[PDB]
Short mmCIF file of C-alpha atoms in Angstrom, two decimals:
data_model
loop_
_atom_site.label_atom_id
_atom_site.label_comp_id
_atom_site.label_asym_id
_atom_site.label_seq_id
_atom_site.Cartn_x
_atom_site.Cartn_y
_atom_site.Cartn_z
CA UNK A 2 15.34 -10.19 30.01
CA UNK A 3 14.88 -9.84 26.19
CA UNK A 4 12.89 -7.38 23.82
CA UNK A 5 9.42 -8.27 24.28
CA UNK A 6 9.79 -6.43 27.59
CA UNK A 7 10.83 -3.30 25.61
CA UNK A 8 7.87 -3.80 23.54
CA UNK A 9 5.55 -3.47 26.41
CA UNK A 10 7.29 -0.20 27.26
CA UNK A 11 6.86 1.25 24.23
CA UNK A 12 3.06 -0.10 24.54
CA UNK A 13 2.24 0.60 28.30
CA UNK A 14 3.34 4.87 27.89
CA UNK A 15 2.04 5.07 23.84
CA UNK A 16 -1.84 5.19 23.54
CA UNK A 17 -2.97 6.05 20.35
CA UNK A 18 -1.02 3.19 18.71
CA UNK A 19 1.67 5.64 16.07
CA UNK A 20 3.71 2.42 16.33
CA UNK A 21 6.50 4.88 14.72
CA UNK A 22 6.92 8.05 16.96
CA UNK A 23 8.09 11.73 15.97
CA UNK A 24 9.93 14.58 18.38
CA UNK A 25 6.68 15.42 20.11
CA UNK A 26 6.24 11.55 21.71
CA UNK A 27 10.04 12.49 22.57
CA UNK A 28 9.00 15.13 24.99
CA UNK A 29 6.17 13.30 26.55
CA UNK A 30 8.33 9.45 26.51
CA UNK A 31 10.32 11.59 29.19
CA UNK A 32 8.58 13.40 30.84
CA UNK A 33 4.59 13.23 30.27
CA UNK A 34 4.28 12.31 34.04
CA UNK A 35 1.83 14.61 35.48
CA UNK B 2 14.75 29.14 26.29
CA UNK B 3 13.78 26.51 23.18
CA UNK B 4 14.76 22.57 21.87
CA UNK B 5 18.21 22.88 21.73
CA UNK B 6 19.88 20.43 24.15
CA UNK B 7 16.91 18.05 24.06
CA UNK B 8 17.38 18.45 20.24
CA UNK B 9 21.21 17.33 20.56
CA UNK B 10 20.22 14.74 22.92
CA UNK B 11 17.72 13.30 20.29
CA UNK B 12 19.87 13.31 17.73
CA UNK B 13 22.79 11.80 19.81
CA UNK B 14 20.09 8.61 19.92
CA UNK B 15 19.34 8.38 16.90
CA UNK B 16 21.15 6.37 13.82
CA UNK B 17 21.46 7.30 10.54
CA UNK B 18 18.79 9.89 11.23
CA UNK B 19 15.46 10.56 8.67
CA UNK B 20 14.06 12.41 12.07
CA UNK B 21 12.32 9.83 13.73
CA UNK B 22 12.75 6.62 16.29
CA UNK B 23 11.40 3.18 15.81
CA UNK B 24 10.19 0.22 18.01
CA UNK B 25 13.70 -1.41 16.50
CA UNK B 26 16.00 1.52 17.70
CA UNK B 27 14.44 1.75 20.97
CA UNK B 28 15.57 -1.35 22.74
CA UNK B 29 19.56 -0.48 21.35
CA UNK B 30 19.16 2.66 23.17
CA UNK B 31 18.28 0.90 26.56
CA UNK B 32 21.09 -1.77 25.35
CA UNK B 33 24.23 -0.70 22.54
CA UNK B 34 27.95 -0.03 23.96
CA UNK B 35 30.51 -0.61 21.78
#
């Protein structure tokens, strides 16, 4: 249990690949379920 | 009816706080207590 399981995370529910991420990711990083 | 306690919420997150978050940060959110 260490932090290249976060770093899937962060890969799996990104897309475009902005490997830094601004309020707007925020939004969807919650709640961009459909 | 706007970004207000979402906004206080991502700011509560965030460190020393530029605006953004970082693959670095993200794992001491799902992690830091102390």
């Amino acid at each position: 249990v260490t932090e290249e399981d976060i770093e899937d995370l962060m890969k799996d529910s990104d897309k475009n690949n902005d490997g830094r991420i601004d309020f707007d990711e925020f939004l969807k990083m919650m709640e961009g379920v459909q | 009816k706007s970004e207000e306690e979402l906004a206080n919420a991502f700011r509560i997150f965030d460190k020393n706080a530029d605006g953004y978050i970082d693959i670095e940060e993200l794992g001491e959110i799902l992690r830091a207590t102390g």
